[PDB]
Design an enzyme around this catalytic site. Structure first.
Site, PDB file in Angstrom:
ATOM      1  N   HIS A  41     -10.915 -30.688  20.640  1.00 11.88           N
ATOM      2  CA  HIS A  41      -9.673 -30.645  19.684  1.00 11.88           C
ATOM      3  C   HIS A  41      -9.788 -30.035  18.401  1.00 11.88           C
ATOM      4  O   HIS A  41      -9.081 -29.745  17.494  1.00 11.88           O
ATOM      5  CB  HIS A  41      -9.177 -32.051  19.441  1.00 11.88           C
ATOM      6  CG  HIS A  41      -9.814 -33.043  18.592  1.00 11.88           C
ATOM      7  ND1 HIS A  41      -9.691 -33.011  17.236  1.00 11.88           N
ATOM      8  CD2 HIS A  41     -10.449 -34.123  18.993  1.00 11.88           C
ATOM      9  CE1 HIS A  41     -10.560 -34.109  16.951  1.00 11.88           C
ATOM     10  NE2 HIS A  41     -10.963 -34.753  17.890  1.00 11.88           N
ATOM     11  N   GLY A 137     -12.794 -36.990   9.427  1.00 13.07           N
ATOM     12  CA  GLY A 137     -13.931 -36.171   9.324  1.00 13.07           C
ATOM     13  C   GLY A 137     -14.994 -36.584  10.207  1.00 13.07           C
ATOM     14  O   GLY A 137     -15.968 -36.001  10.311  1.00 13.07           O
ATOM     15  N   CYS A 139     -15.281 -37.341  13.353  1.00 13.38           N
ATOM     16  CA  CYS A 139     -15.072 -36.864  14.680  1.00 13.38           C
ATOM     17  C   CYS A 139     -16.275 -35.974  15.047  1.00 13.38           C
ATOM     18  O   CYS A 139     -16.458 -35.234  14.370  1.00 13.38           O
ATOM     19  CB  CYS A 139     -13.611 -35.922  14.934  1.00 13.38           C
ATOM     20  SG  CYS A 139     -12.175 -36.955  15.005  1.00 13.38           S
TER      21      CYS A 139
HETATM   22  C1  LIG Z   1      -4.198 -37.743   6.611  1.00 14.80           C
HETATM   23  N1  LIG Z   1      -4.775 -38.720   7.018  1.00 14.80           N
HETATM   24  C2  LIG Z   1      -3.864 -39.693   7.600  1.00 14.80           C
HETATM   25  C3  LIG Z   1      -5.771 -38.272   7.810  1.00 14.80           C
HETATM   26  C4  LIG Z   1      -6.553 -39.782   8.394  1.00 14.80           C
HETATM   27  O1  LIG Z   1      -6.361 -40.021   9.872  1.00 14.80           O
HETATM   28  C5  LIG Z   1      -7.664 -40.498  10.478  1.00 14.80           C
HETATM   29  C6  LIG Z   1      -8.194 -41.825   9.835  1.00 14.80           C
HETATM   30  C7  LIG Z   1      -9.106 -42.132  10.636  1.00 14.80           C
HETATM   31  C8  LIG Z   1      -9.762 -41.500  11.707  1.00 14.80           C
HETATM   32  C9  LIG Z   1     -10.771 -42.294  12.640  1.00 14.80           C
HETATM   33  N2  LIG Z   1     -11.522 -41.695  13.456  1.00 14.80           N
HETATM   34  C10 LIG Z   1     -10.797 -40.720  13.882  1.00 14.80           C
HETATM   35  C11 LIG Z   1      -9.724 -39.764  13.404  1.00 14.80           C
HETATM   36  N3  LIG Z   1      -9.128 -38.619  13.849  1.00 14.80           N
HETATM   37  C12 LIG Z   1      -8.157 -38.586  14.815  1.00 14.80           C
HETATM   38  O2  LIG Z   1      -7.712 -39.675  15.385  1.00 14.80           O
HETATM   39  C13 LIG Z   1      -7.577 -36.962  15.027  1.00 14.80           C
HETATM   40  C14 LIG Z   1      -6.920 -36.960  16.210  1.00 14.80           C
HETATM   41  C15 LIG Z   1      -5.521 -37.157  16.408  1.00 14.80           C
HETATM   42  C16 LIG Z   1      -4.746 -36.929  17.767  1.00 14.80           C
HETATM   43  C17 LIG Z   1      -5.571 -36.843  19.086  1.00 14.80           C
HETATM   44  C18 LIG Z   1      -6.874 -36.807  18.817  1.00 14.80           C
HETATM   45 CL1  LIG Z   1      -8.092 -36.635  20.154  1.00 14.80          CL
HETATM   46  C19 LIG Z   1      -7.705 -36.731  17.586  1.00 14.80           C
HETATM   47  C20 LIG Z   1      -9.267 -40.305  12.157  1.00 14.80           C
HETATM   48  C21 LIG Z   1      -8.050 -39.786  11.530  1.00 14.80           C
END
Ligand SMILES: CN(C)CCOc1ccc2cncc(NC(=O)Cc3cccc(Cl)c3)c2c1
Ligand SMILES: CN(C)CCOc1ccc2cncc(NC(=O)Cc3cccc(Cl)c3)c2c1
Ligand SMILES: [Cl-]
Lengths: 299, 300
Positions: A41, A137, A139
């Site tokens: 992704h 960040g 990931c």
């Molecule tokens: C702008 N702010 C709200 C961002 C903080 O969000 C975050 C906060 C914590 C996170 C912890 N782990 C992993 C993240 N990443 C994801 O889940 C991204 C994503 C979205 C849709 C599908 C996929 Cl496969 C992956 C985290 C993101």
């Protein structure tokens, strides 16, 4: 004496963490030999093979410490992107890619911008999620175990679910659980307690001088499972009984004898008491983790 | 999201662990530059431990009595000196894996990561706090002596603890990297007991702020308290007195969540009075005191 949630020394894994940037996205990569592994992704209904065909090697910026790595090729394997780099990692350890089963534990090296920031121990829940500690960040952060000198990579972080729990894949890009790498309505299933792990933790408490919960009683495996099913506990199998054998011999308490103590703890609670400094029944120590922490096995 | 007891990555410390043998005793050493640091009780027998005269035992030792092993390589000892309760072995080889480091003395309530070793080999890493009674609730077996506690803030490793002994209650005692014990303890097999322990109040408050940051507010109430009234209630539950420094240190978390420190103190008073009533805070049924205000700002 003492009982802590203990992680494996992270050193062999730290030497593998790199930062991967593709466009606006920045996440972590695992650099083993001349290949960098990261969630696919990073290039982002996504038709990933169609998005990847548009990308060229120089679109992916790989950074190992203060050095830039040159991408010379790329391929996708399930939900992981494999970036062929021009430099082999000199710090590459002896490793294996392993797929773990629910109930099994592992160490997580949480990274941000290719830099490791913390290490913690955790278990793969029966619902395939992990109760991790991850921010934006993180990931590409990996989960591992160590066997002598071989690092067994078992998890790569991909996403956070709405309940604050985490989902990811093995190092071959296969998700743990019924999850997909995309923005859609996904929820973690109803979770259950890892029964064999709680029993191992009760044996660890006996080893550390905590015997208040012991009783003279025993139970049949069927009668224990009928009770365990009522409290959202995973069914205890004959394999679990066999695996608890060494701890049963060391303490002198039969597995079905320890099961009768757990039965009373479920039906009556702790009554203001604690076990190993905990007011809850702990399920993130496997029988092997208990044996290793009460013998002193080194890496 | 999520809140875990997190340790620092142990890699920079792993590259420093060596095995030190003197006679029958074998423990761990910390190899930084051309010096190996280890507990001075490595020169003692179990008989000597009652009333050891370390200066007398050390004058009788020569460099070739100490066998230092770094992995599969033997290090040559070229000198030795004692600084308080630590023995400093001058070796012929400087450690190429020596990181950027400092020796720091921590105060009770401060947290650190412990790399537990046996025979110069690291086996596990865990996070823990220096208790108000100066002991650490560690996980150590025989042969763990010389295992170190550290913090890795930015690129520097700050060594703050070296394991020396286990007390009769299963708790652990040790020194800073200058050989000065934390607490009223001695590296002697005399009747020593850990003092009555107390809860690190400032850490529990920081952990309550971490729960608010993660969306949990069930424990909040409409009351506030004076600092004196909070301490009078806290003392009765074996909680450490909250000082004006603790209040100042909780300032950033108070601003971030919009909950005044004495307002959060009011929730804690209520929690001590009522218990949790079947509820949990950050997956815990007890009030957690091993996360400092700095740890909460780092992790959340
Ligand atoms: C702008 N702010 C709200 C961002 C903080 O969000 C975050 C906060 C914590 C996170 C912890 N782990 C992993 C993240 N990443 C994801 O889940 C991204 C994503 C979205 C849709 C599908 C996929 Cl496969 C992956 C985290 C993101
Ligand atoms: C059963 N028993 C005889 C085996 C040893 O058990 C243990 C078990 C756990 C231990 C954990 N940390 C550190 C140990 N070592 C010591 O306490 C050594 C010692 C003794 C007197 C004074 C000093 Cl300063 C140091 C531990 C020993
Ligand atoms: Cl401090």
């Amino acid at each position: 004496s003492g009982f802590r949630k203990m992680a494996f020394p992270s050193g062999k894994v730290e030497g593998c963490m790199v930062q991967v940037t593709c466009g606006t996205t920045t996440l972590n990569g695992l650099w083993l030999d001349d290949v960098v592994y990261c969630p696919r992704h990073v290039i982002c209904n996504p038709n990933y093979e169609d998005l990847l065909i548009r990308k060229s090697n120089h679109n992916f910026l790989v950074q190992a410490g203060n050095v830039q790595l040159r991408v010379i090729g790329h391929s996708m394997q399930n939900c992981v992107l494999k970036l062929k780099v021009d430099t082999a990692n000199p710090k590459t350890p002896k490793y294996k890619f392993v797929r773990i089963q629910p109930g099994q534990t592992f160490s997580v090296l949480a990274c941000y911008n290719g830099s490791p920031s913390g290490v913690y121990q955790c278990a793969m829940r029966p619902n395939f999620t992990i109760k991790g500690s991850f921010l934006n960040g993180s990931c590409g952060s990996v989960g591992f175990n160590i066997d002598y000198d071989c690092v067994s990579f078992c998890y790569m972080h991909h996403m956070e679910l709405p309940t604050g729990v985490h989902a990811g894949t093995d190092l071959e890009g296969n998700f743990y659980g019924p999850f997909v790498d995309r923005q859609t309505a996904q929820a973690a299933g109803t979770d259950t307690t890892i029964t064999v792990n709680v029993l191992a933790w009760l044996y660890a408490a006996v080893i550390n001088g905590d015997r208040w919960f012991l009783n003279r009683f025993t139970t049949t495996l069927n009668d224990f499972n009928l009770v365990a099913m009522k409290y959202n506990y995973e069914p205890l199998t004959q394999d679990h009984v066999d695996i608890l054998g060494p701890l049963s011999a060391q303490t002198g308490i039969a597995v079905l004898d320890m099961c009768a103590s757990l039965k009373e703890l479920l039906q009556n609670g702790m009554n203001g008491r604690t076990i190993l400094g905990s007011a809850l029944l702990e399920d993130e120590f496997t029988p092997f983790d208990v044996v290793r922490q009460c013998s002193g096995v080194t890496f």
